[PDB]
Amino acid sequence: SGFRKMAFPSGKVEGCMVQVTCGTTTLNGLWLDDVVYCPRHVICNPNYEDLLIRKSNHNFLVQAGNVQLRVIGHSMQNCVLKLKVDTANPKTPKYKFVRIQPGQTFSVLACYNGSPSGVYQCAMRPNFTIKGSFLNGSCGSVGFNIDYDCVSFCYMHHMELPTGVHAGTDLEGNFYGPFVDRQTAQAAGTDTTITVNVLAWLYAAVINGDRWFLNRFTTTLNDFNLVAMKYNYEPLTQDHVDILGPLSAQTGIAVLDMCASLKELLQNGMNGRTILGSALLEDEFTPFDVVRQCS
Amino acid sequence: SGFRKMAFPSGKVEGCMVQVTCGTTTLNGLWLDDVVYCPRHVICNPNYEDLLIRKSNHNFLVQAGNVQLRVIGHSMQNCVLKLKVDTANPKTPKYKFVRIQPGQTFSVLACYNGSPSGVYQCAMRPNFTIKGSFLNGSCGSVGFNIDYDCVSFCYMHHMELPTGVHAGTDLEGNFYGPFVDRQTAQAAGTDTTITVNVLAWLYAAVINGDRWFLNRFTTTLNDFNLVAMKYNYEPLTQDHVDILGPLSAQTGIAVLDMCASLKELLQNGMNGRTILGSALLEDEFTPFDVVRQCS
Ligand SMILES: *C(=O)c1ccc2ccccc2n1
Ligand SMILES: *C(=O)c1ccc2ccccc2n1
């Protein structure tokens, strides 16, 4: 019982975090096999091809705990630098580089000077930002999920936008969203609420004994989506209905039955009550997140 | 910028988690130096002295990943069993066993069959329960804080109470609160809101640019505490005022100035607004937690 914002255990990623310094700029890097991945900002509308051609291997100081790693090659892939080192990281886990979709969640290992400081769970927003917690020095911190023994890296941190939300890249150095790795007037666009996740969280609440918002009514997918549009919720697809199957079967509450509760909650509010300790509808838990915690 | 429920990186604790089996009962244990600590329930109003005298070392199967550890001695300390093994854990961090106070926070590494599954942040409630997320098999999961390189273990998980909240012990096997490690009708008593933490979180909100709840008024400590009593908030002490000093100085908002905002929020509610993404007043962040994230 209970339901928490829960991150993956971070140890497999902690053993990969290093410090990268070029000039007077220091940030975090990710050491997997004999390559260190970090934001290309470490070499700073400049032309990064020009900036990198002017560097050599000895300009890069890579520190793994107390050991200095010798850089033997350098190259750029999109907004990430790849520094080849002379030593494979003996702590390299099984890993993949996997780009995530808006609405999916991941764990963030916030790091400063190559030293992990904290771990928390984030969702990729529909507008391709994350609501992270990052201070100066956090560039190069990574986001990930873990399946069995395999770390799927999905995010490297680059930027804070004017509203205080965050923007970054996949591990191929391609930005999530229409953002760049320099100071411009760029700003997050309008966001929307992740409907399938709200429904998953309502199922988590039922599994944990919160039932006050349930009702006898069912709705049609079409009539639900008309209400979703009015409150800035994403339309519900049949694929989303399908992915909620397991939770619907465990609770005995049909997906379109739960949709009628959500419609009522949007129209009427909570009337001073809470669900799973929240006074708002939470949209940062996926159906998989719920199944993992509410087994 | 940003403010998240943030746990400590769990790697130092992950390297200590083992599986302990006795009979048909399996749960988690904590392997530090040559001792494994686990809930004494693994040997199951019985007399545990009698139950343990009837065991021998060979009745305990301890598995660290794929390696079986040989048990060479066994003893009980309060509600924890201590199994001496023939091998010191080479991954033992610097550590301490430290009992925490109500109102303080810690990270929980939820574990099943000796395998870490997730990490989240918890506060010890005034009524000595935690609002955890634990399923069957989680007995022996631990809570901790980390300072520099040193893990301060403060919690070992034992019980789920009828309301779905959780009860456990320090690493000396002494329960937090008036609970026992067997099935009785025991229930959590009435809880209260941790006032100093709510104030710390309001400072976190100001640091992050949420200012709508501020006002020009100040109050007296006495008049504040009269309102706290009415809404089931703990009384504010001068020691708590003192610990909020650093946050008061960073924001330029006197503690008793912030108390006048909290009084207004309790009397009037939020009027459809949010603070740091919440529609309720959050009390599970200590002043230290805020300073760590809002540096
Ligand atoms: C960190 O990786 C990073 C990338 C880009 C950038 C631009 C401007 C200020 C700070 C930055 N940090
Ligand atoms: C786990 O450590 C534990 C302790 C005590 C207990 C009593 C009854 C049921 C389950 C239990 N688990």
DSSP assignment of B120-186? EEEE--TTS-B-----TT-TT-EEEEEETTEEEEEEEEEEE-TTS-EEEE-TTSPBSSS--SS-SS-
Ligand of minimum distance to the alpha carbon of B175: 2
Identify the H or E element spanning A73: strand A71-77
DSSP E strand stretches across A88-219: 94-97, 105-112, 115-123, 142-147, 150-160, 166-169
Q: Is B10 in Cβ contact with A5 (below 8 Å)?
A: no
Structure letter (DSSP) for residue B4: -
Query: Which residues, numbered 7 to 36 in chain B, qualify as contacts with chain A under a Cβ-Cβ cut-off of 8 Å?
Result: 7-12, 14-15
Taking the alpha carbons of A212, A218, A221, A222 in that order, is the dihedral positive or negative? negative
Vertex A173: Cα angle to A156 and A289 (nearest 5)? 45
Joined together, the tokens standing for residue B45 give 């109003």
Q: Is B2 in Cβ contact with A132 (below 8 Å)?
A: yes
**Residue A26 and residue A77 in contact, taking contact as beta carbons nearer than 8 Å:** no
**Residue A71 and residue A62 in contact, taking contact as beta carbons nearer than 8 Å:** yes
Identify the H or E element spanning A257: helix A255-268
**Residue A69 and residue A90 in contact, taking contact as beta carbons nearer than 8 Å:** no
**Residue B186 and residue B273 in contact, taking contact as beta carbons nearer than 8 Å:** no
Q: At what angle do helices B221-230 and B255-268 cross, to 10 degrees?
A: 30
Identify the H or E element spanning A30: strand A25-32
| Ligand 2 binding pocket, CB closer than 6 Å | B 27, 39, 41, 139-140, 158-159, 181-183
CA gyration radius for chain B?
22
Joined together, the tokens standing for residue B66 give 């794929």
Joined together, the tokens standing for residue B212 give 């709508």
Q: For residue A118, which phi and psi values (nearest 5 degrees)?
A: -170, 165
Q: What is the resolution of this structure in A?
A: 1.5
Contacts (Cβ under 8 Å, ≥6 apart) of B249:
none
**How far apart are the CA of B206 and the nearest CA of chain A, in angstroms?**
13
Contacts (Cβ under 8 Å, ≥6 apart) of B34:
B84, B85, B86, B87, B88, B89
Ligand of minimum distance to the alpha carbon of B26: 2
Vertex A208: Cα angle to B188 and A203 (nearest 5)? 160
Contacts (Cβ under 8 Å, ≥6 apart) of B242:
none
**Residue A128 and residue A177 in contact, taking contact as beta carbons nearer than 8 Å:** yes
Q: For residue B146, which phi and psi values (nearest 5 degrees)?
A: -125, 130
Determination approach: X-ray
Count interface pairs A-B at CB distance under 8 A.
123
- Assess whether the C-beta atom of A85 lies below 6 angstroms from ligand 1: no
**Residue A29 and residue A140 in contact, taking contact as beta carbons nearer than 8 Å:** yes
**Residue B199 and residue B205 in contact, taking contact as beta carbons nearer than 8 Å:** no
- Assess whether the C-beta atom of A168 lies below 6 angstroms from ligand 1: no
Q: Cα(B165)–Cα(B132) distance, rounded to whole angstroms?
A: 6
Residue B209: left (phi > 0), alpha (psi -120 to 50), or beta?
left
SS3 B67: strand
Q: Cα(A240)–Cα(A219) distance, rounded to whole angstroms?
A: 16
SS3 A121: strand
Q: How far is the CA of B39 from the centre of ligand 2 (A)?
A: 8
Whether A58 sits among the annotated catalytic residues: the reply is no
SS3 A269: coil
Q: Is A241 exposed, middle or buried (0-12, 13-18, 19+ CB in 10 A)?
A: middle
Does the beta carbon of B6 lie under 8 angstroms from any beta carbon of chain A?
A: yes
Q: Cα(B124)–Cα(A84) distance, rounded to whole angstroms?
A: 46
Q: Cα(A37)–Cα(A85) distance, rounded to whole angstroms?
A: 11
Q: Is A277 in Cβ contact with B279 (below 8 Å)?
A: no
**Closest atom of ligand 1 to CA, residue A182:** 7
Contacts (Cβ under 8 Å, ≥6 apart) of A294:
A3, A203, A204, A207, A208, A250
CA distances from A167 to A57, A127, A129, A138, B168 (A): 28, 10, 5, 12, 40
Q: At what angle do helices B255-268 and B195-207 cross, to 10 degrees?
A: 100
Q: Cα(B36)–Cα(B21) distance, rounded to whole angstroms?
A: 12
- Assess whether the C-beta atom of A284 lies below 6 angstroms from ligand 1: no
Q: Cα(A275)–Cα(A203) distance, rounded to whole angstroms?
A: 11
Q: For residue A86, which phi and psi values (nearest 5 degrees)?
A: -85, 0
CA distances from A281 to A26, A70, A233, A265, B137 (A): 39, 50, 11, 9, 30
Query: Buried (b) or exposed (e) across A53-74, using 16+ Cβ within 10 A?
Result: eeeeeeebebbbeeeebebeeb
Rounded to an integer, what is the distance from CA B188 to the centroid of its chain? 16
CATH T-level topology, domain B12-85: Thrombin, subunit H (2.40.10)
Residue matched to tokens 């320099």: A182
Ligand of minimum distance to the alpha carbon of B181: 2
Residue A128: left (phi > 0), alpha (psi -120 to 50), or beta?
left
**How far apart are the CA of A262 and the nearest CA of chain B, in angstroms?**
18
**How far apart are the CA of B210 and the nearest CA of chain A, in angstroms?**
11
Residue A23: left (phi > 0), alpha (psi -120 to 50), or beta?
left
SS3 A151: strand
Of B11, B164, B277, the CB nearest to A14: B11
Q: State the CB neighbour count (10 A cutoff) for residue B238.
A: 9
Rounded-to-10 torsion of CA B68, B71, B76, B82 = -50
Q: State the CB neighbour count (10 A cutoff) for residue A216.
A: 6
* Chain B residues touching residue A121 (CB < 8 angstroms): 4
**How far apart are the CA of A59 and the nearest CA of chain B, in angstroms?**
30
Residue type present at position A245: G
SS3 B109: strand
Summarize chain B as % helix, strand, coil (round to 5): 25, 30, 45
Q: Cα(A278)–Cα(B2) distance, rounded to whole angstroms?
A: 19
Q: Cα(A258)–Cα(A16) distance, rounded to whole angstroms?
A: 43
- Assess whether the C-beta atom of A94 lies below 6 angstroms from ligand 1: no
Q: Cα(A85)–Cα(A63) distance, rounded to whole angstroms?
A: 11
Longest dimension (CA), chain B: 69
- Assess whether the C-beta atom of A12 lies below 6 angstroms from ligand 1: no
Q: Cα(B109)–Cα(B7) distance, rounded to whole angstroms?
A: 9
CA gyration radius for chain A?
22
Q: Is B190 exposed, middle or buried (0-12, 13-18, 19+ CB in 10 A)?
A: exposed
Q: Is A184 exposed, middle or buried (0-12, 13-18, 19+ CB in 10 A)?
A: exposed
Whether A139 sits among the annotated catalytic residues: the reply is yes
Q: Cα(B210)–Cα(A34) distance, rounded to whole angstroms?
A: 44
* Chain A residues touching residue B277 (CB < 8 angstroms): 131
* Chain B residues touching residue A132 (CB < 8 angstroms): 2, 4
Identify the H or E element spanning A81: strand A80-85
**Closest atom of ligand 1 to CA, residue A156:** 2
DSSP E strand stretches across chain B: 17-22, 25-32, 35-39, 60-64, 67-69, 71-77, 80-85, 94-97, 105-112, 115-123, 142-147, 150-160, 166-169
CA distances from A95 to A109, A148, A164 (A): 16, 11, 30
- Assess whether the C-beta atom of A236 lies below 6 angstroms from ligand 1: no
- Assess whether the C-beta atom of A156 lies below 6 angstroms from ligand 1: no
Q: In what order do the strands lie in the sheet with B71-77?
A: B67-69, B60-64, B17-22, B25-32, B35-39, B80-85, B71-77
- Assess whether the C-beta atom of A159 lies below 6 angstroms from ligand 1: yes
Q: In what order do the strands lie in the sheet with A71-77?
A: A67-69, A60-64, A17-22, A25-32, A35-39, A80-85, A71-77
- Closest chain B residue to the Cα of A120, Cα to Cα: B6
Of B58, B50, B63, B61, which is closest to residue B18 (Cα–Cα)?
A: B63
SS3 A150: strand
CATH T-level topology, domain B195-294: main proteinase (3clpro) structure, domain 3 (1.10.1840)
Name which residue sits closest to atom 10 of ligand 2, judged by CA.
B159
**Residue B170 and residue A7 in contact, taking contact as beta carbons nearer than 8 Å:** no
Does the beta carbon of B110 lie under 8 angstroms from any beta carbon of chain A?
A: yes
Summarize chain A as % helix, strand, coil (round to 5): 25, 30, 45
Residues in chain B: 295
Residue type present at position B292: R
**Distance between the two ends of chain B, CA-based, in angstroms?**
9
Residue matched to tokens 């790795």: A181
Joined together, the tokens standing for residue A174 give 């391609």
* β-bridge mates for residue A28, sequence order: A19
Joined together, the tokens standing for residue B38 give 């686990």
Does the beta carbon of A132 lie under 8 angstroms from any beta carbon of chain B?
A: yes
